[PDB]
Curated annotation (Swiss-Prot), chains A, B, C:
Keyword DNA-binding: no
Annotated transmembrane regions: 1-21, 40-60, 71-91, 110-130
Membrane topology, as annotated: Multi-pass membrane protein
Any one of the GO BP annotations: digestive tract morphogenesis
Keyword Membrane tagged: yes
Organism (species): Homo sapiens (Human)
Residues of the full protein shown: 109 to 515 of 521
Protein name, entry field: Vang-like protein 2
GO cellular component: apical cytoplasm; apical plasma membrane; basolateral plasma membrane; cell pole; cell-cell junction; COPII-coated ER to Golgi transport vesicle; glutamatergic synapse; lateral plasma membrane
Length: 362, 362, 362
């Protein structure tokens, strides 16, 4: 990442060097030129300000991911910046600096062309890195291998590793959080005719979850009726009203297998959060009634540095119809299937709004 | 917004002024120049057409929101357009217009550099206003403070007010519509051991909602069997078949607290809409069975001009990990929590499709 | 589509022709020029490489749809490329080629202006085709006319046919798959007071779906316990463990009307898929328990070449508040209603985090 900052600093200082070396080295040898040179100095100044603000807006940011192989398009852009700036330096050396060029208008036009080329490389960087994948080309079915939480997405032309990082960004807010606490045909006919134990255990579990949920709703309502706006801190008020709801919260988190997701300190911080921002009991309970996504919880449960990209294809290739890859973790795996978004043939049919006529029969 | 139109008109007329003032003021004093000048006139004409079509496509539109503070990047762009065009006017005045420049090739190259700079400012405007927030940087948990309807979003680098307008654009089609019609530990142990009244009231409410829903489904099916395609207007046919379903619709909207959402005229317009476009009874009922989002209903219920941005941070700053802000309204409040999308470290693992081998034991 | 490739090849070869015809036709007549010409040759080479890589990244791809009328903005871009390149050819012919221009610096600057104009046309193409619709302007309610599956979307400034293709791209992964197997007021009062047959048939159907689902879950769990990692192919292992679950799968697909969606070969391929990628029984069953979207199934069920755009407005116009159009198919119709995203007026309200004070009463 240091080579990118080196290329950025060199590319920013190279037009200023190309403009400031002939007045510093051969000033009296240099030919005087008219107002066209100074107008091109103004163009260099404003276009370098545009280049600096654009590179600030899109490229002066930390890397959001560590890819297992090389970023192909970003390495292409770095090689393009390197070869462009090195070729401009080589030409400026062997045909302007060593030759002691007198026509300063040509040197300033050369710097103008350099800044135009750097702005066009910045535009190509936006095209390659951000604009290429806007048009949706593929539909991704992403399924957890453990509980079968499935979402579908539309993705554009990206490589498999960039699609993988994209899916991991969707995963932490789209799927529910992972919870690990949640002859032959004749034997199958004999077993399927037996007592349907799982049906009644499921009905018992749904019934007792609804009962513990009702106890929790009544507990948190009667808890939030113990305070009112106004001396007592929201931490102290949350600690006061937690005692009238800790037992029903503990019972509901035991019956829904959500015990290690919510410590007592996290529930106290979320109580302080809810009574600070004037949230009702139901807006408090929405964090606890359902499972909720992975980013809702503590950072020790994210484990975002422990993902593994398992693909039979080399992961720098783009997607195609039939690509399946795994986003493995120590706990589960995200199975990703790729299908091509199909070709559409729309036809146009005109109807008349007058032509909608009706009868009373059938 | 008038200053933006003034800057746009001035920036469009400034290259034409820079090209047309030397033939109008000093024509016989002006030096003749070759075909390079006329080729640059062609470049000025086509690049100004490109600039006009791009500014039409992205910037000749009404403001979608009224922000509580200044749009920082748009004011930066307006200051950049102003300082660029004013500096080109000052140089053209004090070094071309007052000096009566004879080298017309330099003046036309100066206008070419001006149009290139305006196209680069337009590109910087697209980078700052639209391309900066494409890369998702933050996950937003947006929760209504009243009923706890929660959605998560990925947002890029935006200020808090632009994130707020973005969330309000997501709110009108993502959340359901707001419906306002919907010692201590020993006392909590005594209360949680009492009769679970809320559980049975919830079961009674779900049962009677399912019964009124079944009555409504049978009513709307038998209502739509009273007409057929073909003389009778769809308004007249909707008014005819509404009488066989108005009672069950009124009972279902009473039992689900959806009475002021649906007037009789709105249900008649939606009946005319459904029988016009050949919609089934279930496609009619999907508007009424669930609550549905806020933009599905009448404009007096949107109240989009009554939002309030409550943030402890000054709202022109970008988001960071831990920003919480409220989108208050007179009825409720959207509590928005910001978390950073975590850094990913993908590793690559190669598996062999031949290496998937299986046994029959366990 | 051949005219677009012809314009692309002509636009790529035109600057090289403008640079290479004066050394090939009048070489000794041609005036020698300094290092400014060669620096502009370097600028032409790198900017043509930028133009080639950008046109590869965004425009060297197959059309994703067949629109019923002309793509208005793409035809505008093709007319702009055609008129620009034809005007540069006409000027180069009648003022450089026929006149036998000696000032070669003007010819090379003319080619530089041509490549700058082509890069600006490419930028305008990105603005018109991709950047115009990023800012969400409209909310689309898309409802199937048969079962009332409804989704809402935010769309930007697009024409009705491009919005239609956009909705069809959202449709194949957002909606569930279409399943066709799923005086007057006094008579309505008499019928609504009768036996609520549909309520009890619905409760019976939900109960038997839960029972067949429980049988299927137990069957697929006991089926996946018949194999283990390690000689036997995943096709052979899937065929072995399918016999202990085919009866409960067939019963669940009969009771949920999902019989023609899943052939025996498709279930065997998905079993091989799940045991290959170490998916649990629940991750196998997520494809079968719910309906799921249309792209999840076989390509004979997509029928993406059979959509019909029914609009009272001519479909090359952009959306506005109140546009309703149909995306008809032989089976159903997607009714699309357009509403304008409302204007927001945010106000700012500062609260003090110290000012959150609380009491114990009420």
């Amino acid at each position: 990442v240091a080579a990118g900052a080196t290329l950025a600093l060199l590319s920013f200082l190279t037009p200023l060097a190309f403009l400031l070396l002939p007045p510093l080295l051969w000033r009296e040898e240099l030919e005087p030129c008219g107002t066209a040179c100074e107008g091109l100095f103004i163009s260099v100044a404003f276009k370098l300000l545009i280049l600096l603000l654009g590179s600030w807006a899109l490229f002066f940011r930390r890397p959001k991911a560590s890819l297992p192989r090389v970023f192909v398009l970003r390495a292409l852009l770095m090689v393009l910046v390197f070869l462009l700036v090195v070729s401009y330096w080589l030409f400026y050396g062997v045909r302007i600096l060593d030759a002691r060029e007198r026509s300063y208008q040509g040197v300033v036009q050369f710097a103008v062309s350099l800044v135009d080329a750097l702005l066009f490389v910045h535009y190509l960087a936006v095209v390659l890195l951000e604009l290429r994948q806007l048009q949706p080309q593929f539909t991704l079915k992403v399924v957890r291998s453990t509980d079968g939480a499935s979402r579908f997405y539309n993705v554009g032309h990206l490589s498999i590793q960039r699609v993988a990082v994209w899916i991991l960004e969707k995963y932490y807010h789209d799927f529910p959080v992972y919870n690990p606490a949640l002859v032959i045909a004749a034997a199958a006919r004999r077993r399927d005719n037996s007592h349907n134990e799982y049906y009644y255990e499921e009905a018992e579990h749904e019934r007792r979850v609804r009962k513990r949920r009702a106890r929790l709703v009544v507990a948190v309502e009667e808890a939030f009726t113990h305070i009112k706006r106004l001396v007592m801190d929201p931490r102290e008020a949350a600690q006061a009203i937690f005692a009238s709801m800790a037992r029903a919260m503990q019972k509901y988190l035991r019956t829904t297998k959500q015990q290690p997701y919510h410590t007592m300190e996290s529930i106290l911080q979320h109580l302080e959060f809810c009574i600070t921002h004037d949230m009702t009991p139901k807006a408090f309970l929405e964090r606890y009634l359902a499972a909720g996504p992975t980013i809702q919880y503590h950072k020790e449960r994210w484990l975002a540095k422990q993902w593994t990209l398992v693909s039979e294809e080399p992961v720098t290739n783009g997607l195609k119809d039939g690509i399946v890859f795994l986003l493995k973790r120590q706990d589960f795996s995200l199975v990703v299937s790729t299908k091509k978004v199909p070709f559409f043939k729309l036809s146009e049919e005109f109807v008349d709004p007058k032509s909608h006529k009706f009868v009373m029969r059938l």
